[PDB]
Design an enzyme around this catalytic site. Structure first.
Site, short mmCIF file in Angstrom:
data_model
loop_
_atom_site.label_atom_id
_atom_site.label_comp_id
_atom_site.label_asym_id
_atom_site.label_seq_id
_atom_site.Cartn_x
_atom_site.Cartn_y
_atom_site.Cartn_z
N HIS A 59 0.85 -1.31 0.05
CA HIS A 59 0.08 -0.01 -0.16
C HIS A 59 1.06 1.36 -0.10
O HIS A 59 2.01 1.23 0.29
CB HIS A 59 -0.99 -0.03 1.18
CG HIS A 59 -1.56 -1.16 1.41
ND1 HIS A 59 -2.90 -1.49 0.53
CD2 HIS A 59 -1.65 -2.42 2.26
CE1 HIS A 59 -3.59 -2.71 1.12
NE2 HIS A 59 -2.80 -3.15 1.78
N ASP A 87 -1.41 8.62 -1.89
CA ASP A 87 -1.35 9.94 -2.57
C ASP A 87 -2.23 10.96 -2.10
O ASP A 87 -3.29 10.72 -1.94
CB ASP A 87 -1.82 9.46 -4.04
CG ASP A 87 -2.15 10.80 -5.06
OD1 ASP A 87 -2.23 10.63 -6.25
OD2 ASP A 87 -2.00 11.89 -4.47
N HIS A 93 -3.98 14.35 -2.63
CA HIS A 93 -4.29 15.52 -3.56
C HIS A 93 -3.76 16.89 -3.03
O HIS A 93 -3.40 17.93 -3.99
CB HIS A 93 -5.43 15.32 -3.76
CG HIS A 93 -6.01 14.27 -4.62
ND1 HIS A 93 -7.25 14.16 -5.34
CD2 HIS A 93 -5.44 13.18 -5.21
CE1 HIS A 93 -7.50 13.12 -6.00
NE2 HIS A 93 -6.31 12.51 -5.83
N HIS A 98 -5.73 8.66 -1.30
CA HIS A 98 -6.25 7.68 -1.42
C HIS A 98 -4.95 6.71 -1.79
O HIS A 98 -3.83 7.23 -2.12
CB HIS A 98 -7.14 7.37 -2.60
CG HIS A 98 -6.42 8.16 -4.03
ND1 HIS A 98 -5.70 7.28 -4.86
CD2 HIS A 98 -6.50 9.14 -4.82
CE1 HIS A 98 -5.20 7.91 -5.71
NE2 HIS A 98 -5.82 9.09 -5.76
N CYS A 99 -4.78 5.39 -1.49
CA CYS A 99 -3.78 4.56 -1.87
C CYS A 99 -3.93 4.32 -3.53
O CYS A 99 -4.96 4.47 -4.07
CB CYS A 99 -4.28 3.03 -1.34
SG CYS A 99 -2.86 1.89 -1.46
N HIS A 122 -7.55 -0.69 -5.43
CA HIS A 122 -7.37 -0.07 -4.00
C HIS A 122 -8.55 0.74 -3.73
O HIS A 122 -8.81 0.65 -2.60
CB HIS A 122 -5.95 0.23 -3.77
CG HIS A 122 -5.00 -1.00 -3.44
ND1 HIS A 122 -4.06 -1.11 -2.46
CD2 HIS A 122 -5.04 -2.18 -4.52
CE1 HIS A 122 -3.54 -2.32 -2.64
NE2 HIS A 122 -3.66 -3.00 -3.76
N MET A 169 -9.89 2.44 0.03
CA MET A 169 -8.78 2.95 0.63
C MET A 169 -8.43 4.25 0.14
O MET A 169 -7.62 4.75 -0.64
CB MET A 169 -7.37 2.07 0.28
CG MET A 169 -6.31 2.04 1.19
SD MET A 169 -5.26 0.66 1.20
CE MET A 169 -3.99 1.56 2.18
N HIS A 206 -26.96 16.40 -1.74
CA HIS A 206 -28.19 17.24 -1.80
C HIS A 206 -28.97 17.05 -0.16
O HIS A 206 -29.02 15.90 0.32
CB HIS A 206 -29.44 17.04 -2.56
CG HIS A 206 -30.58 17.62 -2.33
ND1 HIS A 206 -31.25 18.67 -3.09
CD2 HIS A 206 -31.50 17.62 -1.32
CE1 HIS A 206 -32.39 19.20 -2.64
NE2 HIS A 206 -32.46 18.55 -1.75
N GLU A 211 -29.34 24.12 -3.99
CA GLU A 211 -30.06 22.91 -4.01
C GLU A 211 -29.42 21.63 -3.73
O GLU A 211 -29.43 20.64 -2.93
CB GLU A 211 -31.21 22.94 -4.80
CG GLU A 211 -31.08 22.54 -6.36
CD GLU A 211 -32.05 22.85 -7.12
OE1 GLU A 211 -33.17 22.24 -6.90
OE2 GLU A 211 -31.92 23.55 -8.22
N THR A 212 -28.54 21.39 -4.78
CA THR A 212 -27.58 20.27 -5.20
C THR A 212 -26.44 20.68 -5.76
O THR A 212 -26.59 21.50 -6.58
CB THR A 212 -28.53 19.44 -6.14
OG1 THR A 212 -29.82 19.03 -5.57
CG2 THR A 212 -27.63 18.06 -6.38
N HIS A 245 -27.76 12.97 -5.14
CA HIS A 245 -29.11 13.24 -5.69
C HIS A 245 -29.40 12.66 -7.24
O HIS A 245 -30.05 13.13 -7.88
CB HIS A 245 -29.41 14.69 -5.67
CG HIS A 245 -30.97 14.80 -5.69
ND1 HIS A 245 -32.05 14.40 -6.66
CD2 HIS A 245 -31.82 15.29 -4.47
CE1 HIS A 245 -33.18 14.72 -6.37
NE2 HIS A 245 -33.27 15.17 -5.20
CU LIG Z 1 -35.08 16.14 -4.21
CU LIG Z 2 -6.24 10.68 -6.90
CU LIG Z 3 -3.71 0.28 -0.60
#
Ligand SMILES: [Cu+2]
Ligand SMILES: [Cu+2]
Ligand SMILES: [Cu+]
Ligand SMILES: [Cu+2]
Ligand SMILES: [Cu+]
Ligand SMILES: [Cu+]
Lengths: 337, 336, 336
Positions: C92, C95, C97, C132-133, C142, C147, C252, C276-277, C303
């Site tokens: 494993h 990363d 971001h 994330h892995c 993964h 992960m 939402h 709203e969303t 949603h």
């Molecule tokens: Cu709705």
């Molecule tokens: Cu990524």
């Molecule tokens: Cu992993």
């Protein structure tokens, strides 16, 4: 506002009109807050959604897919009388995304066949907003059976661009986009059902593939074409409100643009400008403002072109006026090399 | 402008360059409005898109998937000569999303094999914009056969941030992303066809599933990796134009960011900043500006990682320069 | 900063908590930049994701899906001790971001079972960010094994709206959304396996359909309901951090709104308002700020309502307080 203060407000009764048209309204608010009154009768009804005659047991606010656009101004109250006639078989309610509390009103509007209800809410935020049915345990099934629409809450001072300049439209259309999930037989032909309930299990199976069989405007393939094409003129300012209660869409006016696009549908969020293709996530409405500059036919589409041209998500505009050769000209028409 | 004024504008011919490279241009406009002339020849040809010899009957503007990036400035005219050789078997046209009227030019450029056409349009709006073929009744089939590209209409004064400070790139790349829908036989092996038309019915069946078999950059799995990785150096400012003519994507520079991202692709809309992953809807182009700060290999992906690493939507950058331990350091290397 | 300058900075050890809760932190930074220390042990473990007893071989940072939210301020250093116990079977890495260089740290954190590593990076950009892995050649497998998680890099002066007015939350929750791809036998029943490797081939086949069998919050259908419903009171200001490492989502709050939404997750990009969303692309985190105005039950959903109510992407809030009849009232309750 107190109960007494709200009781003192003027009442205005509005007659709804069928999409893609929008009931008469003023862009800039006339006078102070009002209680704007709407009535919708729910109809469970068979509709045809394509030229082959494919049937859906639709669940339709006001008998249409989408349901009609309700227009109010910020800080008006929207007062809906919702009726579920005894001829229907299912319980229905309504969730206004514009509203605050009780699951957008869904918790207060559960009506069995033979029942009605009156919901009032304060339209506190300006924008276009989805509404849809949402009976606990049967939510997506009602929505993808067409039981959704939108409202517009205009700012009291009408629309403005991101920098405070007034934007006044000459006309408005409401395009409700619908993902349908129609079961097929072993021949790959669409199934017809005697009762809405008969289709439930087969339909859930299609729904779970997340792949609609049809993606349509105004309830059917080609619904906004031919004598039902939308219309405009060179120089005309058009607002196109677009909703999708369940699934993402990416509107595009082929041959045009979105000059100002409230992609999130919310008018206090400054619009994007000069858009080629905008994006409205499932569960939302958006609005695009455009001034037509060229005459002729336009296609207005969901710009997943498979969705547009194979699955049904394409409408037309017919536009009158003088051709502008400055903007575009055919220097050499198709001819032999 | 008056008729005489348009007629008097300088005409300039520009030679195109295959993606991901971009033809010679200036960021700030040189002189006044011009009629910028381009020529593209349409090629119908079989291309291999993966490591298993999978074939597509490509429909390629200028012989490439994506078609080449054309660069002009706001209020220039783009005047394209489009040629459909007699050896081709299909009618083709072009819709410029940058253009206004006649379905983006599609209504005026329908050319049968052995025909050519010249379209001019005024580039009134700044941004990156998709273009694609769109023959009535066969639009998505042409587009998902790779017949799409993009243009860039730079503001006459070059790029700026949301606060009006100038943003000047050292280099620009164009990444066109393509969803392909390759039919398979009942054993799951991809099918091959003699002529493009022979694949039509089987291909539409795959298209209607809304599930591409391949999602690629520059027309093939791994086209922008290995010896064809894009390059940069620490301190270098890079603009990455990205398009997808039919289907959503979500670009991400693994190891980096989008410092400024015009996610809608339109330069009059202020760019988002400090982006991890941006979103470009199907039928649009976007652009991301980044200053590289660390050397080494970067992956540049559609960040649906199944699309990136199973279906083909992954490119690399190779970046030279000095490592910056302030930004990142391994305090303890992997160990017992 | 020089090595010496960094070595002189204060250190703070943080104890992580399980989502949707977030470890103790201050919205406005307390003092100058620090090296903020976190430790996570990776656990490969079976999780049950629905009421049919469906199992996933989870690969879980800190034993949870999603991994816990780590909170620092801009220009702090995040120093992660990552541990891969001998009880695990796979390599494993991680990363971030939020980080710059070496594939977000992935290139420097590859640890086999029985190994650990320590990575430090400078949190130069404020926002919520996915981590994330990403082991080369097994990246999406993964990620969709759960992960992944997120971090929040707060501005040192805490949150503000687009006009510079302070936004101070009373509560914060972290909703990690997970797309799972569980193989089924010929009778349509979910398969079970007795090692993570045994499921690989079958799982990849499902992944390549781009159609998740389950879309869930906090690792399971109904996880954030009942005993785990999120809570608030009328008047309370709540930040909801939402991540999706692999696939798009559209959060939402049913019954409410996103008063301010950093849809891109980045605090230097002004938030959208009155939402709203909202939309978060796969490979990103976003954050929404809302002040509750009504008591009662809310649903918080992706949603796409099929994803929410057929596939699992629905959480609840339970909110105490006084009903506001101005905002909403039943003028006539459901009646004949
Ligand atoms: Cu709705
Ligand atoms: Cu990524
Ligand atoms: Cu992993
Ligand atoms: Cu197009
Ligand atoms: Cu209903
Ligand atoms: Cu073509």
């Amino acid at each position: 506002a107190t109960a007494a203060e709200i009781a003192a407000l003027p009442r205005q009764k509005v007659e709804l009109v069928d999409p893609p048209f929008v009931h008469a309204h003023s862009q800039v608010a006339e006078g102070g807050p009002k209680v704007v009154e709407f009535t919708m009768v729910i109809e469970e009804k068979k509709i045809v959604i394509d030229d082959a005659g494919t049937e859906v047991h639709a669940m339709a606010f006001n008998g249409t897919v989408p349901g009609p656009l309700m227009v109010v101004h910020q800080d008006d109250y929207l007062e809906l009388t919702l009726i579920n006639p005894e001829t229907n078989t299912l319980m229905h309610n309504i969730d206004f995304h514009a509203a605050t509390g009780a699951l957008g009103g869904g918790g207060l509007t559960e009506i069995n066949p033979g029942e009605k209800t009156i919901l009032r809410f304060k339209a506190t935020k300006p924008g276009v907003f989805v509404y849809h049915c949402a009976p606990p345990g049967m939510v997506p099934w009602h929505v993808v059976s067409g039981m959704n629409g939108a409202i517009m809450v205009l700012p009291r001072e009408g629309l403005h661009d991101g920098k405070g300049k007034a934007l006044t439209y000459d006309k408005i259309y409401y395009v409700g986009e619908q993902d349908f999930y129609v079961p097929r037989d072993e021949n790959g032909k669409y199934k017809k059902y005697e009762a809405p309930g008969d289709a439930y299990e087969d339909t859930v199976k299609v729904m779970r593939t997340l792949t609609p069989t049809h993606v349509v405007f105004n309830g059917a393939v080609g619904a906004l074409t031919g004598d039902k094409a939308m219309t405009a003129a060179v120089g005309e300012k058009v607002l196109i409100v677009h909703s999708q209660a369940n699934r993402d869409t990416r509107p595009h006016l082929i041959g045009g643009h979105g000059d100002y696009v409230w992609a999130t549908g919310k008018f206090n969020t400054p619009p994007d400008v000069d858009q080629e293709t905008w994006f409205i996530p499932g569960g939302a409405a958006g609005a695009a403002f455009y001034t037509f500059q060229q005459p002729g036919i336009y296609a207005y589409v969901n710009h997943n072109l498979i969705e547009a041209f194979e699955l049904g998500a394409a409408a037309h505009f017919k536009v009158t006026g003088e051709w502008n050769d400055d903007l575009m000209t055919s220097v050499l028409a198709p001819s032999g090399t």
